[PDB]
Every structure is written in C-alpha cells, then in structure tokens.
DNA sequence: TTTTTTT
C-alpha cells in the first residue's frame, strides 16, 4: 500500500546543510552571521517572524561550489518540496537559536510562565510549534526560475503544487482576519496536568478526553478544558488573486485564486493594488463529505511566503537631484505627457493637482479640503483623453473613468454589504473622468456631493479623500465663440465653484503650429521618445509629489492680504463682467479658497515651508490663462 | 491480467508494426528532455490511427472497441513501457518519478458505428470505445485530480504513498479508493501528506450537446459528458463543435441499490474521452508552393491590384472599395512604443450608398473574405453592445462585437442607420483601440462600414459628410470614407444586367442547367492565405521617403481648402502611415515603398478630398 | 435584499 521509493535527496543531510547555512551565511558582501542576528532578534522577541531568502541559499551554494564542497542544492530542493523543507528550516532555526540578549518579558507572557511551571510539574513535552513564537517565510529567488518568474492563475499547474512560486494578478478580495489554533492546549482538573494538541488541519476534533498520566494513575475520566491563554493562536487571512487582464485570453474571464496568509503576513494586502507574491503552491484538502463526492479531484490553494505590491535617504537624494536640475515645477509639467506636444499650462495645473494643497481644519470644527480638482475643456483631437489616461498612469492609485462607461453612483461606490467604488479606489489618488461633458447631470450631482466634502453619504460612509480631474468636450462637440464660455462649458455653477480650475482649449488652424505638432508626432512615431528638456521618470515624479505634499506650506499676512485683494478684485470683475461672452462665472469666496489651496500646492512644489505671494499670483495666473486661451480665439 | 499482459505484448507489437508511433513517443520524450534543458514539455499522450491498430491486429482493434477497459489500459501500459525504454529520462525529478505519467492512447479515423452522436448513443456503446461528435455545452471548470496521495511518515525516512482511482477516470470498474490522506503511516509513525510528491492531474468533464441541426424537430438534442484529463481538459468550450474519441461507460447503481426505492432512475452513463478534437465545422493554411506563388504575386507589378481584383470579383463597380478592403485586411502595422503609445494595426473604411447599391453586399463579401469577421446592422446594432457585452450569469462580462475578433475587421451594414451614441462607443474602438466600462475590453478591431445617405439617395449638392449620418469627428476617426451609391447609366446598366445574368448563368459543377445548386485572380482561399502570409511574414516599416510622402500628404490635406469627407488631422496622418504599411504588407515588403505610401495616400485622398 | 436590467 506504501511502496517506498528512494529519491536523490536525503532530508537529514539537507537539514544539516540548512543548519550549517544558518550559522555560516552572512551579509559580508553587503557589509556575526546575518541569520544569527535575526535569530538573536527573535530570541529577544524583537523579531516575530523569519524570512529565509532563496537567493541567500543560492549564494551559500555558490560559496560551497567555490570551496569545492558539493552543494545539496537547497535552493532547488526548496522549489522541489518547500513545504517539507520549511519544517527542516524551523528545526535548524531552533538548533541555531541564540540566547536572548534582551529579556523576553516572560512574566507578561502567560504562556511562558505556565510553560516553566508545567516543566517543573512534569519533572517534546509541549509542541515545538507552541514553543516557537516566529513564523517562517521565503523570499523569492533573485533573477539571474519558477519562483523568480511570476505566474498567472491559468498559467499555474497542478504539478506546481508543493513548489514555491510567484504569482501576479489583481487581488479580488481578502478574507477577514481569523484566529488559527496552531496548537490547542487542553487542561483537566482531575489530573492537574495540561495536555497539548497541535492542530495542523483546516478543521480539528477536540481531544475531549484527558490524556494526562496523572488522570491515568488516578483512573479518573477527566473532561479536558481548552485554555485560550494556553492554546496557541495565530491570525489567519485569505486573499483572492485574479489573473491580470493582459494575462486573460480574449474571450476568457480571469480566475481568482484563494491564498492563505498567516501570522505576521496577515493583513499585509489591499485589494486595490496588484501584488506579486511568492508562495508554495499546495493542495487544499477537501472535507470528508465533499471529498467523498470529489473523488481523486482535489481543491488547491497557495500559502504566501513573500508578498510584494507594485504600488528616505534615496528618495531625498532623488528629490535633491530634481531640485538641482531646477525649475522643478515647469520641469515636472513638461515631463507630464512628454509624447504630447504643447498644453504645458494644463500639465502645470495637473502637477499642482498632483501635489495638492494643504488641508485645513479649524479648531471650532470647520474643515476646508486641501485636495485640488481640475477640469479640461477642449475640442476633439486635442489629446484630452490621451492626457487623462497619461495622468491616470502617472497616479499610482488614480482611477480612469468614462462618463458613459460607469454610472456616477457606481464610480462613487458601486452597489453590488458595501464595496468601494472608483472614488474609493481613488482614495489618496486622482479619479479621472473621460468625456466628462457626456456624463449626466444626475451623476454629476453624486460627484458634487464628494467634491465639496470628501466624505460620501449613503447607511454607510467613507472618507473618500481624492483629487478630481475631468476632461470634457465643448457643447455640440466643439467650442463656439458665439456661445458664451459658460454655455460651451455647459456645467452647473456649483460644479464650476467646486472645481479649483477649468481649462478651455480651442482647435485653431495654424501653419507653424501644424508643422511643429507634425514634427513632434512624426518624431514620436519614428522613435518612441519625444524629440525634445528630458522628462523625469514617473517614480521620481511621484516621489517629488509626495515630498511636496509633506511640506504643507502655511499662508502669511502679506499673502493673505494679497489674496483678499484678489478676492475683492475677482468679485468686482464678476459684477462688471456679467457679459456672458466674457463671464467665466461669479467670484467665489470658496474659489479664493481653491485659490488658497493652489497657492499652497505651488509652495509645496517649491518646497517652501510657508505659502508665498508668488504662489498665489501663479494660481491666479493659471486661472487667467484659462480665460486667455479663449480670449485669444 | 494475463490477457492484459497479452494485450500489452500485442500493443508493443503494434508499435513495432508502425515505427511512427514508437518514434512519436520517443519524440515526445526527447522534446521533453530538450525543452527541460532549454527552459514547454509535451504531455505523455499518443494518438494513433484506429485503422493502424486494425492493421497491426484487426482482432486487437475490435477488442479495444468491445472492451476498452480490458484492452486500452494494457495498450497504454505497453506504450508507456516503450516510452520509458526509449526515453533517456536524464536527471528525472523525484516528483516526476512519483508522477510516472502514463502514455495515453487514442484511435483516429475510421470509426464507423463507433462514430456516434449523443442521440444515437446506445447502452450497448457503454463499456465500449466510441467517437462522439456534438456541440460542447456546460463544460466543467478544470479541477485538479489526484493520481496518488503521496505522504511521508515523520522521521521514518520513507515516503509512504497512497494511490487513488476514479471510475470515470479508469475505464475498468474499481472499488472506490478512500481518497483520504492517511492520518498515520502503516509503520505507526504519524503520516504527513507530501505536497509536490503527490501528483495532481487536471480533470474536466464536459457535456457535449448533439448538434442543433442534428437534433430532431420537436426534440432537444441529447448531451453526453466526456471525461477529459491532462491536455484533454479545457480542450473545448460550450457552444463550440467538438469530436471526442471516448468510451461510453455504464456507471452507478441505476436504481439497483436498495436506497433507490422507485428504481426508476437508469444507470448513470458518462463517456470517458481518450482525446478531444475541436472542429471548425476558418483559418487559411499556407504551404511552400502557395508561398512561392505568393512571392511571385508580390513580384507582380501590381500585387495589391491583383489581390483587390481577386477580392469580390463578382461585385461590380466596388473595385476601389475592394482595394481599400485589401489595405484594411492587411490592417497596417501595429506598434507599441516604449512610451506606451499605441499605433493601430487596423484600418477602418466607410462607404455610403442607397439601398441595393451592393455596398452592404460588398461588406458581406468582405466578411466572407476575412478569415474572421464581425457582422452587424446599424438598425440592429448597438454601439454599447459592440464595445462590450453584459451577461446576467454574479454577472459575467462578455466581449463586445468590436471586442470580439479584436484583431479581425468588423463589417457593419447600415452604419449610418447606427445611432451617433453607438458611433461614439465605436469611436472608442476606432481611436483608443480599447473600451472602458469598470471592466475594460480591447477594441482595436478594424471597422469596415456599409452606410446609406441620410436622405436615402446621395446628393452631389449635399456634402459627403452631410449625406452621411456620421459626425465629422467619426469620419475623421474612420481611416477612409467612401460614397458608393446606386446609379442609373445606360452602358453601366447593360453591364450590371450582364453581370447579374452572368451570376445566374454560372453553373455549379455538380448541377447542370435546370438543376438547383447543392486578368488572373487568386482563388479566395489563396488570397486569404496571401493576406495571412503578409501579416505573418511581412512587417512593413516606415522609410524616410515613404514617411515624408505621408507627412506631406497629411499637411497638404490640412492646408487645402477643398472639401473633404472628413476633417484632416494628425490622426489622418497616422492613418496614412498605417495604410502605407498595409499596401507594403500586400507587397510583402519589410520597408514601405515611397510609391506605396503615395498609393495609400491616394486611397486616403479618394477617401477624403475626392476620387483619387 | 437589492440592484440591475432585460424583457
């Protein structure tokens, strides 16, 4: 029934090699042993988990090859049976565990106090897993291959079971954290002795009968009582990773795959971001009754080892490099959509929105949003959609949306228990709306509920803090000078006031402009790079945006007085400019607020500790250019 | 057993009689070794002619048909032994040795009574090899099986393994295996299941509805599930025709058990498919002789003209639209920049004409000429549906008509009758080459459009855009716009009447006059093969001269005050470059000729400013 | 239950 098959691997010698590697391996190339230092941290309880790097094992095997000693191929044997090798790794960690350099606070650890007492009363008494307070993990092998190469859900195969492997795909959902009894401790009063049971299955049958030798000697039939303070418990969480849309074949739906995340690895993931997680693919045993029907067919799962989501001194150095390159605001603006030619003012406004303004909350309770919102109004074929998609790609958490593609309620929060909508997915990001003119005013009301106050009201509520961007075509598909600017915008004055700035661009034939645009476009076609200033990398651009946001500049007396004078001037200019052809909308105290946020964003991009009158004038100039683009005609 | 050993020896004798089968098993093994070294490993499954097994031993072939459980297992064991002997099996993995993959056997061709349909399937076919063909339906999602629950007793040093068998998976009936991992080893040490060492083969059981045409009127087509394993799993999907060589198997108590008091239920019957064959009923096939002929055709002075004249040869007066259709069939070159900007590999053409102008007939001919095409009618077409589709199913997303055949061209009748909102959803396909709903579906498909004037009769006084229902932005989104409408001329009417009379006078070879049916031009399959060969072997790229020609053409289109079907744009410049790549693809040239770019710009000029 | 949307 059990035909033994000798295989070209010996677990004893492999574990001896693992224990040797734990003590010998050190980050000398990066520079006691590094693994020994991690073990000492775990002994101090400063480290609650262990992660064994497959690249470290490969480097140790290469060192053994240089020494001439034959490598046990530990890195490859991990790919062979990582689940089996993990127990040997834990045993080697127990063997090579240093004494705690720092006190473990054993008195606070009721389990430790009771463990000393139980050993004294007893004088593998308790499970080694119960003795261990750390969780093993495996770092994916460095590229130089199943673990190193990420896989899709459909790409994964049943042969990959028992093997460490990395996967790529959208996280469909994450199960709520639940306790997991790694070891259940049973206690019986009749014996006075504790009996431990180690649970390694999805479900367990309680002992329900005292196994204590004291109860056996007394002949009493004791009723075991589980103790939460004595039984080991570990957080258990599940994740559903679904295949990336590119990985999905045409005409096929991506498949979500359940993943088991336990211990310190629990709660690490968020559904919004794509994750590249290396984990030992393993079968999921069926229950008894369901397995009787399933037969040889078996369920499967993945136990994550190393989790990585796509999206300091180095960041500070990069920001300093951008500052040394200089003119950072205009440089980032030109870096936005380098393939697109022109629209530098729109790019600068987009960069200001990306940096955002300072969010202010008064002591009395008033809260003024610091997030900036922008709108783009342009004739067809002016790269409105292209610029919006480029901005969405620039935003790590931003979401691109279309007015016809998604309902306003669905974008704010799509009803199926509530689930986050496109705006919630745009939390700490920028929600982009393509063809915003086509979007219905009914959904625009839902957008207006959130633009003025970040929170969403439905009951269920979410903070929904984000920056709003909109791209709209002018009424009848193109701008009409006979139509007023407000008529061509075709938007509510509430929307205009909630928006910090709206940009109007017109398509006017021009020989030199056509020649320059054709030159840039032909250069882009013949060579993917734009002809010409070098755009900053998107990672450094996002880092600079975060560094600007960290500044949080405050207004000064001179800047505030100048902004008040500008507010009076704008109100008077609206009172005199009731002519619809020249009227862009009445002056707004809230708009001066939006102006305050834009000045704060400019001072953030300049990294000024306080807002500057130059920043306020630059924001006013952005609005002035928004009007002057139409004035030029 | 002993008969199974005799069958193993006889199947080894069959493999000796047909050296190609043993060579194919060894070729799978050698390819597996070479591909394991290079990195893509061939499954250990072998398909042989049923007539070949009959030639080796008619008794063996008929015996496999009569008792597949008794014969096919021993025959596959013989094939596996031959494969194990032939294979070098260098550096085998412990998991691979645990897998011990059997060499599957399948019979091909000459099925006869074994060839079957679900309605014609019989209880006598149960426990007998058969071949069943029908439309697939209700295919099961792939679920991993378990060849053996390999385990390892703790500290014992020995890996105890427990095999599991399934009656559907094994043609022979067997007492059910526990299918439960042992809690403790036979030695008494605690037993832990060995993941990885345990072997899991994907298993899928797909029902196969009888073909709806084969289904009797007043009756629903019968459906018989076919077991699939390893590569056979997920071989076909519901709604797709398939033929599977599989042994029908009686199964279950069928009311014989004491629990079934009524005993009305019959014994469960599930076919166990040795192999699954998807069936077209397409895709053109290219051979070396046809490739040399295609090279000669490209060497012809007007290769694009020859291909266009071959396209829709019976259609009259739409030859320029057919040249544009050949350019669209090439599609141009698709480019993905390091910046991420996308250049479309598809060209969209629109032609407006009165009903019975045969512009929609030319569009239908283009749908037939394309190996894959999407058909829609503007009165019955919704652009939201073309961009994406929604199924109630949680709801399951469905590809839109434009998203369907995302590489292939889409021919639309009455495109002017299609609404402007539908045209905006189509513009998402035309320019962005992708559709966003929050689900996103790629929509890079070419959109050939048959349309009619809004008045129903084209007017020369009316602008072409005014006659077209599409907006000027939509016309710009289209790579080409045409005005082919019905007209009355005397000589042309005599010619068209002679053409219709010639279509009537055309005689099918099998049907004589008075019997109902049922300068050189490449045959339609050969021209489809030429287009496929263009896309497969030629990737035209912009040259300096051709690029300058396209740029100057776009600049002059933007500069000229003469009326155009669509406003000139940088998108029109990109369309001119793509059409140049399409003409060069028809030419099978890696670099687009400057004259080819000028000819594509001439097609675009015929599309916009006027006939050119 | 509650959207969602096709009848």
UniProtKB/Swiss-Prot annotation, chain A:
Member of which family? Belongs to the MCM family.
What this protein catalyses is:
ATP + H2O = ADP + phosphate + H(+)
The root-end lineage is: Eukaryota, Fungi, Dikarya, Ascomycota, Saccharomycotina
Q: Does the keyword Hydrolase apply?
A: yes
One Gene Ontology term of the molecular function aspect: DNA replication origin binding
Miscellaneous note of the record:
Present with 166 molecules/cell in log phase SD medium.
Residue span of motif Arginine finger:
497-500
**Entries under Pfam families matching the protein:** HTH_MCM7, MCM, MCM_lid, MCM_N, MCM_OB
Task: Tell where it localizes.
Answer: Cytoplasm; Nucleus
Summary of the function given for this chain in its UniProt record: Acts as a component of the MCM2-7 complex (MCM complex) which is the putative replicative helicase essential for 'once per cell cycle' DNA replication initiation and elongation in eukaryotic cells. Core component of CDC45-MCM-GINS (CMG) helicase, the molecular machine that unwinds template DNA during replication, and around which the replisome is built.
Q: Please report the stretch or stretches of sequence annotated as the MCM domain.
A: 328-522
| UniProt name for this protein | DNA replication licensing factor MCM7
Q: Which GO terms describe its biological process?
A: DNA replication; DNA replication initiation; DNA strand elongation involved in DNA replication; double-strand break repair via break-induced replication; nuclear DNA replication; pre-replicative complex assembly involved in nuclear cell cycle DNA replication; premeiotic DNA replication; silent mating-type cassette heterochromatin formation
**Which proteins does it associate with, and in what oligomeric form?**
Component of the MCM2-7 complex. The complex forms a toroidal hexameric ring with the proposed subunit order MCM2-MCM6-MCM4-MCM7-MCM3-MCM5; loaded onto DNA, forms a head-head double hexamer. Interacts with CSM1 and MCM10.
Q: InterPro entries annotated for this entry?
A: AAA+_ATPase, MCM, MCM7, MCM_CS, MCM_dom, MCM_lid, MCM_N, MCM_OB
Q: What keywords would UniProt list here? A: ATP-binding, Cell cycle, Cytoplasm, DNA replication, DNA-binding, Helicase, Hydrolase, Nucleotide-binding, Nucleus, Phosphoprotein
Q: What is its EC number?
A: 3.6.4.12
Q: Where does ATP 2 bind?
A: 498, 590
Q: Does the keyword Transmembrane helix apply?
A: no
The stretch of residues making up the signal peptide is none
What SUPFAM superfamilies would the database entry show? Nucleic acid-binding proteins, P-loop containing nucleoside triphosphate hydrolases
Q: Which domain of life is it from?
A: Eukaryota
- An annotated GO cellular component: replication fork protection complex
Kindly list the positions annotated as binding ATP 1. Answer: 341, 381, 383-385, 473
Q: PANTHER family per the record? A: DNA REPLICATION LICENSING FACTOR MCM FAMILY MEMBER (PTHR11630), DNA REPLICATION LICENSING FACTOR MCM7 (PTHR11630:SF26)
Which species is the source of this protein?
Saccharomyces cerevisiae (strain ATCC 204508 / S288c)
Swiss-Prot record, chain B:
**Cellular component terms per the entry's GO annotation:** chromosome, telomeric region; CMG complex; cytoplasm; DNA replication preinitiation complex; MCM complex; nuclear pre-replicative complex; nuclear replication fork; nucleoplasm
Q: Name where it mostly resides.
A: nucleus
Q: Which GO terms describe its molecular function?
A: ATP binding; ATP hydrolysis activity; chromatin binding; DNA replication origin binding; helicase activity; MCM complex binding; single-stranded DNA binding
Return one Gene Ontology term, BP aspect.
Answer: pre-replicative complex assembly involved in nuclear cell cycle DNA replication
* Domain MCM: start-end pairs: 303-501
Task: List positions binding ATP.
Answer: 353-360
**Motif Arginine finger located where?**
476-479
According to the UniProt entry, the coiled-coil residues are: none
List the catalysed reactions: ATP + H2O = ADP + phosphate + H(+)
The record's subcellular location field reads: Nucleus
**Which keywords does UniProt give here?**
ATP-binding, DNA replication, DNA-binding, Helicase, Hydrolase, Nucleotide-binding, Nucleus, Phosphoprotein
Q: What is its EC number?
A: 3.6.4.12
Q: So what family is this one in?
A: Belongs to the MCM family.
This molecule's function is given as: Acts as a component of the MCM2-7 complex (MCM complex) which is the putative replicative helicase essential for 'once per cell cycle' DNA replication initiation and elongation in eukaryotic cells. The active ATPase sites in the MCM2-7 ring are formed through the interaction surfaces of two neighboring subunits such that a critical structure of a conserved arginine finger motif is provided in trans relative to the ATP-binding site of the Walker A box of the adjacent subunit. The six ATPase active sites, however, are likely to contribute differentially to the complex helicase activity.
On assembly, the entry states: Component of the MCM2-7 complex. The complex forms a toroidal hexameric ring with the proposed subunit order MCM2-MCM6-MCM4-MCM7-MCM3-MCM5; loaded onto DNA, forms a head-head double hexamer. Interacts with CSM1.
Share any extra remarks.
Present with 35100 molecules/cell in log phase SD medium.
Protein name per the record = DNA replication licensing factor MCM3
Q: Which organism is it from?
A: Saccharomyces cerevisiae (strain ATCC 204508 / S288c) (Baker's yeast)
Taxonomy-wise, where does this protein's organism fall, top ranks first? Eukaryota, Fungi, Dikarya, Ascomycota, Saccharomycotina
